[PDB]
C-alpha cells in the first residue's frame, strides 16, 4: 500500500509501521491534516519520520501516506514572479486561496498552478519517430514579455517521439509529448520534478571568462566577478547590502535572478518582499518589472527548520533549471549564517557529535558542495547552448570575527570578497566597499577579455591599486611629518588618491548620470586620472632633480580648471550623452591636460 | 462540529517516575492531549501527554507525582489538546500561567477557543513597521524609539530595576496623541517571586490602568509547564486582539531567562542530551516561535509590538539566551549596573543601546520633524562627553579647552535631566524633545554639526 | 603521470579509499617494476574531515576537536607507505599537502601529521601578503633526513654549517624585529642593525625566487655565504674555525 500507520509520537519524531518499501529520505504526509516529514531511519517494516510541522494532536493509528520521492522542486512555467519558501510552498497562492494571514498546518497547494493555461509552440522539425535525449528543447512557452520558457526533455529520459502536441493553449497537467524506448512509453507535461540535493547534469563544465558587470565603478574595475563566479559579502546591519542586490537585479548582464532568504528576521523579510516588486528596468525603450525575470525564496525565523536548511538547495535547483535553457543566472543568498544555524539545530535534533563550535562534522563539505554548483556550462541536449549560475552568499561573522566556522569555510571557498563596511557608510562613502580588505581572484581569467575589448585597462587597474595602497602607507608618515614637509611626489600621490577616492570609487546611485556606469565610462574616467598623475609626477621628477622645482602647489595653481574637469567626469550621463560623445569629451580632457603640462614645462 | 463522544477514564497506570505517569491499554493515544488525574484521596491534578507508543501514553503531571499509586489513581483523557478561551473581556483581568482567573472575577466566556501553539504568519502578509509606540521614558522614546510591529529586548542583570522599568512602561505606554482606545497591553511574567508578582498586580490597580491591560502571572514555584504555556496564552490573546479586533497591542514578556530554565527542564524530562552551553539544541526555533508572533499585517488595522525582558549571568551578552535573542529581535535597550550604583533611574545606557527601526517610527507626521537630528546630536555629544571626562583625570581640568568644558557641562546636565526621570513621571515625546533642546542650547550653534541649518533655524532659538 | 581525482561534489567516503588506491599503484611501480615514484596527496585536510564524518556516524571515541580517536594510527597507514627496500632499485617519495584550519599548526591534522612525517615545509600567510614567493617560512619547517643527505661527497662540505648559521641569524633578526616594534629604531645597537639587515636581504635574495627559476644546491649555498658575510666572522658562532677560514674570505 501507499499508506503506513503512526505507531508513536515523541516531539517532532513520528514512528510508523507497514512502511516496508519506503526508502531513506522519502517525504511522507502524516495524519488526517497531512503534515509533511521525511524518513530518517528504517528498521524491519517500520520507519522513523522527522516531521517538519507541529505534531500536536497526531494519534496512534493515523495514516502515513508515502510520496515515492525525496525533497524536490516542480520545474515548469509559473516560476517567474513567484514567492516560495525553502520547501517550495507558494506563499502568494496560499494567501490568495486561504484568505488568511497565517500558513495552515499540512497545506498541500502545488508549487506551479495547474489552472493557468500556457501558449505553447513545438520545435517545428520534431516529428513522430524523431530521436530525442535528456536536455532537448521540444517547445517554448511565452511566459511573459521577457522570458521565453524552454520546455526540455528531463535528464535520465530518452527515446523516439510517439506524440507531440500542436501549437495551442495548455494546462501544466496536459500531456504535450510522448516518447518510447525499448517498447516502454513515457508521457510528459510542461512540469518536470527534480531532487534538490542532486546536481543537475551538463555536457561540460567550463572556465569562467566573461565579467558579471554591476554598473558600479568599484566592483566592476577593482574587484570584478565573472559569470559563473562565486562571491561573499558581509551580512550586517549598517553596511548597506542593498546596493549589491539591486545592482544585480536592475543592471547586471544576468538573464534571470534567484533570491533566497534562508531564516531572516520577519521585518527584514517583509522589507525585501515589499521592495522587490517596486524595482523596474528599461528593456527595448520600455520600462518593465524586475518580477518578470526574478523568483524569490523567503523564510522567516519561525518557518520549519527543514525549510530554512532546504532553502539554498531549492534556490540553486531553480538556478540550474534556467542555466539549462542557456540563460545566465545570478543567485543571492541573504545570509548563509542563518542556513548554517538551521543545519546545526537539525544535527542537534539528530543528537550528532558537536565537532567545531557545535556545528556538524559535514558543515565545510556541505558549503563546498553547494558552491561547486556555480559555473559556466555546455548544456545537456541537442540545440547547442551555454548557460551559467553565479552565486553571491552573504555571511555574518559575530562581532566581525572572521575565524567563525561558516565565515572561515566561506572565504576559504569563494573567489571574490566584496567587503562592505559600516565605517564607510558612516562617512557617507557610498557604495561602502572597503578597497583594503576586498579582493578578486578572477583577474587572470578576465585578462583575455580585457585584452580583446579594452586593452589599456589592466595597467590602469594596477596603477590605481598602487596609488590607493601608497596613501595607506603615507598616512602614518604624515601623522609625524605634518603634511607640509612631505616630498612633492607623495603630495601628488595623496591628492590623486583623494581624486580617485572621492570621484571614481564613490557613486551616488540616486542620481540619473550614476545609477549605472558602463565599462567604457569606467575605463575613460580612470584613464584620465592616471594620465594626469603620470604627467604631474613627470613634471616634478624632471625639474626637482636639479632645476627650479615644480611643486604640487604650482600644479594646482596652474591646473585648477583641469582638476575641476577631472572631478566633473562622473556627471556625464550614458543615456543623454552617447558613447562616442562621452569618449570625445574624455579625449578633450587628455588634450587639455597635455597642453596645460606642456605650458608648465 | 463538536467533539460529542464520551470520555474514557483509565486505572491502568504502569509506572511513576519523576514528573511522569505512564499508562497502558490507552485507546488510540493522541499526542499533546490534556488529561485529568484523580488521586486516591480525591485530590485532582492535570497533565499533558508527553509521548505515545502503541497502547502506552506518558503524561507529564503539572503538579507533583507524590501520593500517586498504580492501583487507585484514575486518569481521564479529555480527547483534545490545550485551547484557550479568548475575548475582549480579558482586558482588565488577572490570570495565572494556566489562564485561570486570580482577580475574583468570573471565568471567561469565550468569543472563540484557540490553539495556544498558533500558526506562523505568512511572509507575504506581513507589512513593514511604521509609527511610534510612546513608552513615556525619554531614554527610550527620544533615542531608542520603538516602531509599531517591532520586537526589541531589554537586556538586564540580577538586582537591576528591570521590573520597575517594565511596570513603568506598562503604566505609561500608548500612541503619541498628535494633532487611543485602539491601544492595549498584554503583560506576561514568568518565574516571578511573590514580592514581584504582588508589586505588578498592586501597581496597575493602584495607578488605575487595568482597562487596557491583560495580566498573566506565573510565580517561581508554579508548575514549570505553566511557564512554557504562559508566553503562548499571552501571544494567543495578542493575536485575537490585534488581528481580529484591530488593536495596537504591546506585549511585555518578563524574564525570557526564566522561560529558558523551564524549557531546559522539560527537555531533560524527555531524556534528551543537553545541547550547546546546557540549553536544548532547538532553543533558537523555540524562541523564534515566540518572538515572530509580532508585526503589522496587510488589510487589518491592528499590530503586535513585543518588548522581551531578559536577565544575563555575569553581565555577559555572549550567553545563549541574549545571543539567540539578538539574532531574532531588531535592537536592544541596555540596563546598566554603573548608572544604578550612581543612584540614577532608569539606569538605561544609551551608548550600547540601539533601535534598528527608529527611522521608521520618527519624523514629520509621526513625532516631530527635528527628532532624528536631536537624537543624532544628543548621542554625539554624550559620546564626546564621556571621552572628555576620561581625559580630565589624565591631563587635569586646567589643560581642558573651552569646548571640553562645554562637553563636561552637557554631560552632567544630560544625566540629571534627560536620563534621570521619576518612576511615576510621564513625558510625551514632545516633552522629551524639548528637554533635548534645553541641553543642546548649552553649545554655540556651530558645534551642533549633526543638525542641518533648517532644523537649527526653527528650533535652536527660545520663543515666548 | 597517474591521476586519481575526487572533487568537492564527489562522494565523501571515496576520499578514504582514494589515497590507498594511489599508494597501492605506487607500490607496484616502485617495488615490482623498480621505478622511482613521487606521490602527491592533495588536502589531507579533506581526507581527515571525511574520516571525522565517517567516525562520528559510527559513534566512536572522539579525540581533539572531535576527530576519530585512532586518527594518528590511520594517517600512519598512509604516510608509512614510502621509502626504499633492500635488494630492489625503486623508491616512493611522498609529498602530502595540508590546509591548517585558521592557520593553526597545533590543530589535530598538522599536529598528528608532524608526529609521523620526516618534517614539513611551511607556507606562511604573512610572506604571501608581502608578495614574497615561494611564501616558505624556514622557522616552523623541518627535514629529519637532511642531516645525512648533505656534506662532503653528498653536496658540499659547508652545507650543514651554513644552514645552521642561517637559522641562527634569521631567528635573531626576527627577535630584533619584534623588539624594534616596542622600542623604535633609535634604541637599537649596531649589532641589532646587522641582524635586521640580514633579515631583509635574506627574504629578498634567499627565499624569493619566482615560479620557473631553478637554482642548484651550489647556487643556493653561495647565495647563503653572500648573506652570512654581512657579519664579522666572530659573530658566526655556529660555524667552526676550519669552515670559516676556507669559505668566509671569498
Amino acid at each position: 500500500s501507499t499508506f503506513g500507520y503512526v505507531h508513536g509520537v515523541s516531539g517532532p519524531v513520528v514512528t510508523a509501521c507497514d512502511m516496508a518499501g519506503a526508502a531513506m529520505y522519502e517525504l511522507v504526509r502524516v495524519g488526517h491534516s497531512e503534515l509533511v516529514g521525511e524518513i530518517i531511519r528504517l528498521e524491519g517494516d517500520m520507519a522513523t519520520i522527522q516531521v517538519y510541522e507541529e505534531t500536536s494532536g497526531v494519534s496512534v493509528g493515523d495514516p502515513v501516506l508515502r510520496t515515492g520521492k525525496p525533497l524536490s522542486v516542480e520545474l515548469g512555467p509559473g516560476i517567474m514572479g513567484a514567492i516560495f519558501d525553502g520547501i517550495q510552498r507558494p506563499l502568494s497562492d496560499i494567501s490568495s486561496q486561504t484568505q488568511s494571514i497565517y500558513i495552515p498546518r499540512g497545506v498541500n497547494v502545488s508549487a506551479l498552478s495547474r489552472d493557468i493555461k500556457w501558449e505553447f509552440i513545438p520545435s517545428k522539425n520534431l516529428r513522430v519517430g524523431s530521436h530525442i535525449t535528456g536536455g532537448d528543447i521540444y517547445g517554448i512557452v511565452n511566459e511573459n514579455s521577457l522570458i521565453k520558457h524552454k520546455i526540455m526533455l528531463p535528464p535520465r529520459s530518452r527515446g523516439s517521439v510517439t506524440y507531440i502536441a500542436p501549437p495551442g493553449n495548455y494546462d501544466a497537467s496536459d500531456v504535450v509529448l510522448e516518447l518510447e524506448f525499448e517498447g516502454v512509453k513515457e508521457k510528459l507535461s510542461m512540469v518536470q520534478v527534480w531532487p534538490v540535493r542532486q546536481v543537475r547534469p551538463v555536457t561540460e563544465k567550463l572556465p569562467a571568462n566573461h565579467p558579471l558587470l554591476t554598473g558600479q565603478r568599484v566592483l566592476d574595475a577593482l574587484f570584478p566577478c565573472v559569470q559563473g563566479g562565486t562571491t561573499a559579502i558581509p551580512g550586517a546591519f549598517g553596511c548597506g547590502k542593498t546596493v549589491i542586490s539591486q545592482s544585480l537585479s536592475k543592471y547586471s548582464n544576468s538573464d534571470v535572478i534567484i533570491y533566497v532568504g534562508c531564516g531572516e528576521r520577519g521585518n527584514e523579510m517583509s522589507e525585501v518582499l515589499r521592495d522587490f516588486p517596486e524595482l523596474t528596468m528599461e528593456v527595448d525603450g520600455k520600462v518593465e518589472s524586475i518580477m518578470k525575470r526574478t523568483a524569490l525564496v523567503a523564510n522567516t525565523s519561525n518557518m520549519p527548520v527543514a525549510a530554512r536548511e532546504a532553502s539554498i538547495y531549492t534556490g540553486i535547483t531553480l538556478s540550474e533549471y534556467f542555466r539549462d535553457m542557456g540563460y545566465h543566472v545570478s543567485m543571492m543568498a541573504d545570509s548563509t549564517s542563518r542556513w548554517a544555524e538551521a543545519l546545526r539545530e537539525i544535527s542537534g535534533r539528530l543528537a550528532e557529535m558537536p565537532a567545531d563550535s557545535g556545528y556538524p562534522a559535514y558543515l565545510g563539505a556541505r558549503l563546498a558542495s553547494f558552491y561547486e554548483r556555480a559555473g559556466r556550462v555546455k548544456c545537456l541536449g541537442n540545440p547547442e547552448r551555454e548557460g551559467s549560475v553565479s552565486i553571491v552568499g552573504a555571511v555574518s561573522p559575530p562581532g566581525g570575527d572572521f575565524s567563525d566556522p561558516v565565515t572561515s569555510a566561506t572565504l576559504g571557498i569563494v573567489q571574490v570578497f566584496w567587503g562592505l563596511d559600516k565605517k564607510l557608510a558612516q562617512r557617507k562613502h557610498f557604495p561602502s566597499v572597503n578597497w583594503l580588505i576586498s579582493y578578486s581572484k578572477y583577474m587572470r581569467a578576465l585578462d583575455e577579455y580585457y585584452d580583446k575589448h579594452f586593452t589599456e585597462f589592466v595597467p590602469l587597474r594596477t596603477k590605481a591599486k598602487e596609488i590607493l595602497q601608497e596613501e595607506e602607507d603615507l598616512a602614518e608618515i604624515v601623522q609625524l611629518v605634518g603634511k607640509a614637509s612631505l616630498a612633492e611626489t607623495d603630495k601628488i600621490t595623496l591628492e590623486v588618491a583623494k581624486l580617485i577616492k572621492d570621484d571614481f570609487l564613490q557613486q551616488n546611485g540616486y542620481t540619473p548620470y550614476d545609477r549605472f556606469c558602463p565599462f567604457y565610462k569606467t575605463v575613460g574616467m580612470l584613464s584620465n586620472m592616471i594620465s594626469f598623475y603620470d604627467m604631474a609626477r613627470r613634471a616634478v621628477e624632471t625639474t626637482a632633480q636639479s632645476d627650479n622645482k615644480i611643486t604640487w602647489s604650482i600644479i594646482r595653481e596652474h591646473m585648477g580648471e583641469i582638476l575641476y574637469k577631472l572631478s566633473s567626469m562622473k556627471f556625464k550621463d550614458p543615456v543623454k550623452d552617447g558613447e562616442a560623445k562621452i569618449k570625445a569629451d574624455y579625449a578633450q580632457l587628455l588634450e587639455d591636460m597635455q597642453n596645460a603640462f606642456r605650458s608648465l614645462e | 462540529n463538536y467533539l460529542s463522544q464520551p470520555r474514557l477514564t483509565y486505572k491502568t497506570v504502569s509506572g511513576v517516575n519523576g514528573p511522569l505517569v505512564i499508562l497502558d491499554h490507552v485507546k488510540f493515544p493522541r499526542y499533546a492531549e490534556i488529561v485529568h488525574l484523580t488521586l486516591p484521596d480525591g485530590t485532582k491534578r492535570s497533565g499533558q501527554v508527553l509521548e505515545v507508543s502503541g497502547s502506552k501514553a506518558v503524561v507529564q503531571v503539572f503538579e507533583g507525582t507524590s501520593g500517586i499509586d498504580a492501583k487507585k489513581t484514575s486518569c481521564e483523557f479529555t480527547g483534545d489538546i490545550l485551547r484557550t478561551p479568548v475575548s475582549e473581556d480579558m482586558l482588565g483581568r488577572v490570570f495565572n500561567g494556566s489562564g485561570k482567573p486570580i482577580d475574583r472575577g468570573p471565568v471567561v466566556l469565550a468569543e472563540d477557543f484557540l490553539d495556544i501553539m498558533g500558526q506562523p504568519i505568512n511572509p507575504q502578509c506581513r507589512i513593514y513597521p511604521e509609527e511610534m509606540i510612546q513608552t513615556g521614558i525619554s531614554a527610550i522614546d527620544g533615542m531608542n524609539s520603538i516602531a509599531r510591529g517591532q520586537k526589541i529586548p531589554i537586556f538586564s542583570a540580577a538586582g537591576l530595576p528591570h521590573n520597575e522599568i517594565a511596570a513603568q512602561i506598562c503604566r505609561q505606554a500608548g500612541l503619541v496623541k498628535k494633532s487611543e482606545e485602539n491601544f492595549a497591553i498584554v503583560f506576561a511574567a514568568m518565574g516571578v517571586n511573590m514580592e514581584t508578582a504582588r508589586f505588578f498586580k498592586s501597581d496597575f490597580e493602584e495607578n488605575g490602568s487595568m482597562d487596557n491591560v491583560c495580566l498573566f502571572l506565573n510565580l517561581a514555584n508554579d508548575p514549570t509547564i505553566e511557564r512554557i504555556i504562559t508566553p503562548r496564552l499571552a501571544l494567543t490573546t495578542a493575536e485575537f486582539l490585534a488581528y481580529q479586533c484591530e488593536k495596537h497591542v504591546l506585549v511585555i514578556l518578563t524574564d525570557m531567562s526564566s522561560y529558558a530554565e523551564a524549557l531546559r527542564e522539560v527537555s531533560a524530562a524527555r531524556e534528551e542530551v543537553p545541547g550547546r552551553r546546557g540549553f536544548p539544541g532547538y532553543m533558537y526555533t523555540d524562541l523564534a516561535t515566540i518572538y515572530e508572533r509580532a508585526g503589522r499585517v496587510e488589510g487589518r488595522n491592528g499590530s503586535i509590538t513585543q518588548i522581551p525582558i531578559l536577565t544575563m549571568p555575569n553581565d555577559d551578552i555572549t550567553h545563549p539566551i541574549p545571543d539567540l535573542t539578538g539574532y531574532i529581535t531588531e535592537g536592544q535597550i541596555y540596563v546598566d549596573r554603573q548608572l544604578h550604583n550612581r543612584q540614577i533611574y532608569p539606569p538605561i545606557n544609551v551608548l550600547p543601546s540601539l533601535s534598528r527601526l527608529m527611522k521608521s517610527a520618527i519624523g514629520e507626521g509621526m513625532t516631530r520633524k527635528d527628532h532624528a537630528d536631536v537624537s543624532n546630536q544628543l548621542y554625539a555629544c554624550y559620546a564626546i562627553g564621556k571621552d572628555v571626562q576620561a581625559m580630565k583625570a589624565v591631563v587635569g581640568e586646567e589643560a581642558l579647552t573651552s569646548d571640553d568644558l562645554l562637553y563636561l557641562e552637557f554631560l552632567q546636565k544630560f544625566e540629571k535631566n534627560f536620563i534621570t526621570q521619576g518612576p511615576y513621571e510621564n513625558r510625551t515625546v514632545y516633552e522629551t524633545l524639548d528637554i533635548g533642546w534645553q541641553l543642546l542650547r548649552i553649545f554655540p550653534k556651530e558645534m551642533l554639526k549633526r543638525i542641518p541649518q533648517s532644523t537649527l533655524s526653527e528650533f535652536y532659538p527660545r520663543d515666548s | 603521470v597517474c591521476l586519481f581525482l575526487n572533487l568537492a561534489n564527489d562522494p565523501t567516503i571515496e576520499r578514504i579509499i582514494t589515497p590507498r588506491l594511489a599508494l597501492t599503484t605506487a607500490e607496484f611501480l616502485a617495488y615490482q617494476c623498480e621505478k622511482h615514484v613521487l606521490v602527491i596527496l592533495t588536502d589531507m585536510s579533506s581526507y581527515a574531515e571525511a574520516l571525522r564524518e565517517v567516525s562520528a556516524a559510527r559513534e566512536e571515541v572522539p579525540g581533539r576537536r572531535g576527530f576519530p580517536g585512532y586518527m594518528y594510527t590511520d594517517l600512519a597507514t598512509i604516510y608509512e607507505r614510502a621509502g626504499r627496500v633492500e635488494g630492489r632499485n625503486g623508491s616512493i617519495t611522498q609529498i602530502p599537502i595540508l590546509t591548517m584550519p585558521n592557520d593553526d599548526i597545533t590543530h589535530p591534522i598538522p599536529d598528528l601529521t608532524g608526529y609521523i612525517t620526516e618534517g614539513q615545509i611551511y607556507v606562511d600567510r604573512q610572506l604571501h601578503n608581502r608578495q614574497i614567493y615561494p611564501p616558505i617560512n624556514v622557522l616552523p619547517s623541518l627535514s629529519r633526513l637532511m642531516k645525512s643527505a648533505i656534506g662532503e661527497g653528498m653536496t658540499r662540505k659547508d652545507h650543514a654549517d651554513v644552514s645552521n648559521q642561517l637559522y641562527a641569524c634569521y631567528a635573531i633578526g626576527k627577535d630584533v624585529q619584534a623588539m624594534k616594534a616596542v622600542v623604535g629604531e633609535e634604541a637599537l645597537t649596531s649589532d641589532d642593525l646587522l641582524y635586521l639587515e640580514f633579515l631583509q636581504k635574506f627574504e629578498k635574495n634567499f627565499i624569493t625566487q619566482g615560479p620557473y627559476e631553478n637554482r642548484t644546491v651550489y647556487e643556493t649555498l653561495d647565495i647563503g655565504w653572500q648573506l652570512l658575510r654581512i657579519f664579522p666572522k666572530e659573530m658566526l658562532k655556529r660555524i667552526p674555525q676550519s669552515t670559516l677560514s676556507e669559505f668566509y674570505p671569498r
Partner: peptide, 25 residues
Amino acid sequence: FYRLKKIQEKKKIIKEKSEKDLERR
C-alpha cells in the same frame, strides 16, 4: 556529551532485554 550518550544506549539495551524477558514470561 559523549559520556551522556552511551548511558542512553546502555539504558535502551536494558529496556530491550526487559521487554524480551516480558516476552519470555
